[PDB]
A paper describes a structure:
Complement receptor 1-related protein Y (CrrY) is an important cell-surface regulator of complement that is unique to rodent species. CrrY is a membrane-bound protein comprised of five complement control protein (CCP) domains [also known as short consensus repeat (SCR) domains or Sushi domains] in mice and six or seven CCP domains in rats (owing to alternative splicing), followed by a transmembrane and cytoplasmic region in both rats and mice. The protein possesses both DAA and CA. The first four CCP domains of rat CrrY (CrrY1–4) have been shown to have full complement regulatory activity.
The structure of rat CrrY domains 1–4 has been determined in two distinct crystal forms and reveals a 70° bend between domains 3 and 4. In both crystal forms rat CrrY1–4 retains the same overall conformation and secondary-structure elements, which can be taken to be representative of its solution structure. Small changes at the CCP1–CCP2 and CCP3–CCP4 interdomain junctions induced by the different crystal environments in the two crystal forms cause the two models to superpose with an overall r.m.s.d. on Cα atoms of 1.3 Å over 239 residues. The structural agreement within the individual CCP modules is closer, with r.m.s.d.s on Cα atoms of 0.53, 0.12, 0.29 and 0.60 Å for CCP1, CCP2, CCP3 and CCP4, respectively, over the ∼60 residues of each CCP domain between the two crystal forms. The overall arrangement of CrrY1–4 is very similar to those observed in the crystal structures of other two factor I (fI) cofactors, fH1–4 and CD461–4. Thus, a kink at the interface between domains CCP3 and CCP4 in CrrY1–4, fH1–4 and CD461–4 is likely to be a shared feature of all fI cofactors. The change in orientation of CCP4 with respect to CCP2 and CCP3 is particularly striking when comparing the bound and unbound regulators, with CCP4 rotated more than 70° away from C3b in both the unbound structures (overlaid ) compared with the bound fH.
Author numbering: 37 to 290
Write the structure that this text describes.
Amino acid sequence: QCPAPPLFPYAKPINPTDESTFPVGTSLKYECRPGYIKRQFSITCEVNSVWTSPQDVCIRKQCETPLDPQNGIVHVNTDIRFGSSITYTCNEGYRLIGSSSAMCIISDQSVAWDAEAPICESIPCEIPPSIPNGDFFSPNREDFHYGMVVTYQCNTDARGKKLFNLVGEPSIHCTSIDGQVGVWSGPPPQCIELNKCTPPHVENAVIVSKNKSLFSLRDMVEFRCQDGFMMKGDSSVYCRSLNRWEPQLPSCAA
């Protein structure tokens, strides 16, 4: 009263023969297919004319233990057996080279990852910017990677004495915004002559006096707060030594 056995995706019959009718109590010899741990078993035709195979008879074969790449991680979403997949990511300051994923597939008479694990390499940087009248200090002057810091310094005169004022942040570091290209954290500083002041900025104010690309000692700057802003400090300031202003730069508060 049993029909022909089911067509199992995980198993095949050891000795298939031409037939389509089996009485209850009939046992047939089956085998696990490629990608499953080798096992020979029996399927039985039960009293209700339905075929029953033993529970968890065919176990999917395991692929090699994945490792986390150095400076990266391996992500096991299900397991490390036949048909499953793994993905890889690199850590902050590193970029992936190779395959970001692998699948556990049939390889010859066993199973294997259809891709090799990737490399997570340090994000490189271009040489930091050149600045007129100064330079940066580095043990390696032409090799930069994520995290590295460079400090700039102004050139001295022919007698080794201070000749310029270093204006702005003296240090910058190799970073990345996209996790692929290395960028310097900010702009390099400027090396300004000792009798000069760089153009002053006061938020929510305009200069009403003559603007200059660069000011000289005792040059005056007059500021005006924008509409609806209140002034704190004197509106007229003069260029001092060390890129300073006397009185100090004013402020505009809403």
